[PDB]
Amino acid sequence: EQIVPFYGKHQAGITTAHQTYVYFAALDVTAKEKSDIITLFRNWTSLTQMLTSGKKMSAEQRNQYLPPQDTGESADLSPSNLTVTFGFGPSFFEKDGKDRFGLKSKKPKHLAALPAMPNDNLDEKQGGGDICIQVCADDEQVAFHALRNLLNQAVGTCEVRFVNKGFLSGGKNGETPRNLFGFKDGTGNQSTEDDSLMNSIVWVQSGEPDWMTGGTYMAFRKIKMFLEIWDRSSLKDQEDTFGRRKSSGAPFGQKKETDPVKLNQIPSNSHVSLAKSTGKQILRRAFSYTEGLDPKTGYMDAGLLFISFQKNPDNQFIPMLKALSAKDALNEYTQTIGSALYACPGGCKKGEYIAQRLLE
Amino acid sequence: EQIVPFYGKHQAGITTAHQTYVYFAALDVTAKEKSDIITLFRNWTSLTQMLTSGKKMSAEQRNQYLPPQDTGESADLSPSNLTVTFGFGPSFFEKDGKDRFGLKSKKPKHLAALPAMPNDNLDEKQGGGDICIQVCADDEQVAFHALRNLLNQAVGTCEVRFVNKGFLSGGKNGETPRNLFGFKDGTGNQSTEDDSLMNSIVWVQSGEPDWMTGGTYMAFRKIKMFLEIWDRSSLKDQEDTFGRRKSSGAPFGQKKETDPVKLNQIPSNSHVSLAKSTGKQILRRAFSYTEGLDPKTGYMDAGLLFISFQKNPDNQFIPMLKALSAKDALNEYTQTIGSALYACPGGCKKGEYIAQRLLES
Ligand code: HEM
Numbered sequence: 001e002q003i004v005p006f007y008g009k010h011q012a013g014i015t016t017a018h019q020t021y022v023y024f025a026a027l028d029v030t031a032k033e034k035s036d037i038i039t040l041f042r043n044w045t046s047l048t049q050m051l052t053s054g055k056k057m058s059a060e061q062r063n064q065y066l067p068p069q070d071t072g073e074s075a076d077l078s079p080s081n082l083t084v085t086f087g088f089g090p091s092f093f094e095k096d097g098k099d100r101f102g103l104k105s106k107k108p109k110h111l112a113a114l115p116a117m118p119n120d121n122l123d124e125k126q127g128g129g130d131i132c133i134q135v136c137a138d139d140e141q142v143a144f145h146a147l148r149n150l151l152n153q154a155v156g157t158c159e160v161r162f163v164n165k166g167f168l169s170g171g172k173n174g175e176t177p178r179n180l181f182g183f184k185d186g187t188g189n190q191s192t193e194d195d196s197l198m199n200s201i202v203w204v205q206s207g208e209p210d211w212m213t214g215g216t217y218m219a220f221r222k223i224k225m226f227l228e229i230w231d232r233s234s235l236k237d238q239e240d241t242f243g244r245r246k247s248s249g250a251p252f253g254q255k256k257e258t259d260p261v262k263l264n265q266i267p268s269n270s271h272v273s274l275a276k277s278t279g280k281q282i283l284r285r286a287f288s289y290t291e292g293l294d295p296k297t298g299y300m301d302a303g304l305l306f307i308s309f310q311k312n313p314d315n316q317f318i319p320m321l322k323a324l325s326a327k328d329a330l331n332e333y334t335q336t337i338g339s340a341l342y343a344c345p346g347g348c349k350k351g352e353y354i355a356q357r358l359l360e
Numbered sequence: 361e362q363i364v365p366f367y368g369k370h371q372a373g374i375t376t377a378h379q380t381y382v383y384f385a386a387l388d389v390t391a392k393e394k395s396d397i398i399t400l401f402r403n404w405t406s407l408t409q410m411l412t413s414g415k416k417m418s419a420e421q422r423n424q425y426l427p428p429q430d431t432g433e434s435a436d437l438s439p440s441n442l443t444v445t446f447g448f449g450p451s452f453f454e455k456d457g458k459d460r461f462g463l464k465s466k467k468p469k470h471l472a473a474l475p476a477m478p479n480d481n482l483d484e485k486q487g488g489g490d491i492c493i494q495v496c497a498d499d500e501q502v503a504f505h506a507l508r509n510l511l512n513q514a515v516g517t518c519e520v521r522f523v524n525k526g527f528l529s530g531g532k533n534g535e536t537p538r539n540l541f542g543f544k545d546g547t548g549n550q551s552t553e554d555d556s557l558m559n560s561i562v563w564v565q566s567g568e569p570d571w572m573t574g575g576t577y578m579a580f581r582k583i584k585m586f587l588e589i590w591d592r593s594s595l596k597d598q599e600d601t602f603g604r605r606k607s608s609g610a611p612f613g614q615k616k617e618t619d620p621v622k623l624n625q626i627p628s629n630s631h632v633s634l635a636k637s638t639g640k641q642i643l644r645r646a647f648s649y650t651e652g653l654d655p656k657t658g659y660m661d662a663g664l665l666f667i668s669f670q671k672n673p674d675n676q677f678i679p680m681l682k683a684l685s686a687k688d689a690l691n692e693y694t695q696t697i698g699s700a701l702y703a704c705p706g707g708c709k710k711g712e713y714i715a716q717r718l719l720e721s
């Protein structure tokens with residue numbers, strides 16, 4: 001009953017209401033024939049449809065001497081609005097000059113590594129990758145189960161580049177969820193329920209190969225947040241960093257979270273002023289992370305798995321990166337340590353597989 | 361609604377129904393006076409009472425120029441049955457041979473580091489600690505918030521040794537939660553609602569310093585689980601490793617999860633056979649963990665944060681540890697990489713602070 005359709009015009013996990021939990025994986029294809037990639041996406045499709053659907057691998061195992069077909073730890077759990085979203089990095093189309101799989105002619109127009117930015121401190125292994133898998137659910141164990149079982153299918157075809165995970169709880173009464181800086185996160189997104197707006201901001205309708213119709217580009221930035229530096233700062237510093245008030249989420253000088261931002265009443269280098277002043281829009285769908293103590297600092301290693309969706313990242317996304325990178329007050333408390341851009345195919349129809357129209 | 365009382369005879373987080381998420385941290389005290397420790401435990405007590413009770417810090421602060429007193433990320437969240445449980449390591453009472461805080465005379469009777477076990481691969485920095493804090497909630501953001509705000513208060517008195525976190529979802533209809541090997545985990549525990557059994561297995565009543573009355577000992581083992589090796593194994597090898605059927609959770613030859621184990625029907629070195637044949641009992645309250653890819657293996661780094669509670673770890677826990685470390689079939693699939701034992705104080709009464717009966721003279 002917490003079931004999100006897998007099949008559709010679009011992949012789920014993009015305009016789908018934001019779940020609590022994410023696992024975010026990137027893989028590199030080690031196989032040499034597009035035929036092996038085809039079988040992988042076919043199997044991934046059939047398994048994703050089962051995992052998200054609420055169907056359970058039912059009463060079975062006729063041969064004790066074989067491994068179970070499923071790892072079993074989601075047996076008693078609800079589907080918890082599980083979505084699984086697939087994308088492909090530039091290196092899937094071309095790696096080191098070689099068109100490894102004969103796909104270059106079906107390359108998306110805007111798929112390239114993101115440009116270097118000031119204050120970047122990228123670990124190459126924490127970004128890029130041929131394929132990304134974004135697994136979301138309202139229950140961590142459900143999302144981990146889905147990733148693990150998808151990844152088990154890729155053995156021999158791909159190597160896993162990295163796996164991150166994160167969380168972001170919505171308010172008990174539907175309030176915008178707060179990031180680890182304690183600020184409402186997502187206010188500035190247009191309504192994911194507004195088809196017109198999602199069409200103009202997220203969804204590909206033209207100018208791209210047909211496998212991208214109903215698809216989008218997914219930007220990923222792994223951004224370390226220095227909680228100890230932030231927590232020791234004044235409220236004034238924290239609000240002046242954003243250009244919104246912390247509790248209310250209101251733009252400075254406004255009453256409500258949803259009041260429009262008045263650019264002339266917020267600091268010119270506040271986060272919100274810089275992002276908004278590009279005049280561009282993206283759909284941000286981020287999750288917080290914590291990964292134990294950072295050994296180099298001896299403080300919590302925490303941050304944001306930044307994930308946004310936009311139909312044209314050269315028009316919509318890269319200008320924001322540019323506008324923020326030098327001037328953002330948030331630069332005091334953050335540092336990007338991983339980066340990637342992926343193209344997300346349009347939705348799968350019942351009886352097709354993911355990226356069928358790309359792989360042919 | 362989702363509020364677990366903080367004050368009581370016992371600390372919460374022990375017999376409390378198992379929440380979904382945990383953050384588990386250890387701290388070392390760098391302060392030299394016990395009066396600094398008294399301050400810390402006082403503040404932690406006031407803060408935990410506020411975090412667990414559901415009261416929210418008034419949003420409004422006079423003085424825009426000061427840091428907010430609360431980090432704010434839980435402002436809109438339910439208390440989610442938050443519990444915070446404190447314990448103390450052997451090094452709180454004596455470190456490097458020095459009784460730093462004049463506490464040695466109040467040391468618990470069974471508090472010492474766990475003995476080395478074969479197959480151990482301990483990272484010494486992933487074990488031990490003067491102080492453990494176990495923070496549990498049904499929502500990870502709530503748990504992290506609590507830990508963060510508690511650790512923020514310890515700046516200047518302690519250093520954080522390590523922070524672990526974990527999850528374990530119970531079934532939609534209250535079925536026993538499954539661990540990452542897909543097996544029900546906890547069946548062999550006695551009921552947390554049977555006062556009689558918790559009093560005889562978990563809760564200290566005598567033979568210990570007063571401040572331990574109503575307390576217990578907390579065993580911690582961070583156990584890496586090699587999911588890739590496990591997943592490739594036959595169902596027969598997985599079930600033989602434990603001595604219960606995976607799906608039903610029933611002991612071999614039995615129909616139901618709850619049926620008594622028949623020792624003669626499971627392998628001698630099966631996990632359950634070895635554990636049960638010690639004759640001893642503990643309360644296990646473990647969570648699974650995943651920490652991204654293991655750089656040494658290229659596979660998921662995943663495992664169990666094993667946490668158990670017992671009134672006398674020398675009697676109940678260590679023989680179990682010894683019997684399993686030697687012979688458990690489960691060793692094929694796992695390795696212990698962190699280890700601790702802490703003494704957890706009796707509960708806090710309203711108007712008192714945690715460990716007051718230890719720290720005050
Ligand atoms: C740790 C890093 C980040 C944090 C903590 C953060 C936090 C926030 C907050 C609190 C707001 C105001 C409320 C809202 O609209 O959601 C906001 C707005 C926004 N952020 Fe960020 N942000 C981060 C990084 C980024 C990056 C890397 C970009 C894009 C390159 C970005 C783009 C935006 C945009 C477009 C808005 C909406 C501006 C508008 O009102 O039109 N943010 N962010």
Ligand code: HEM
Binds near residue numbers: 543583664666680684
């Ligand atoms: C390393 C990961 C471990 C896993 C995956 C694991 C898993 C299990 C499972 C599946 C069961 C049977 C269902 C249940 O009763 O909970 C079980 C029982 C048990 N385990 Fe473990 N366990 C682990 C480590 C340990 C350790 C270190 C100890 C004690 C030192 C321990 C003590 C027990 C006990 C006492 C029981 C119940 C036996 C009885 O029925 O009386 N386990 N465990």
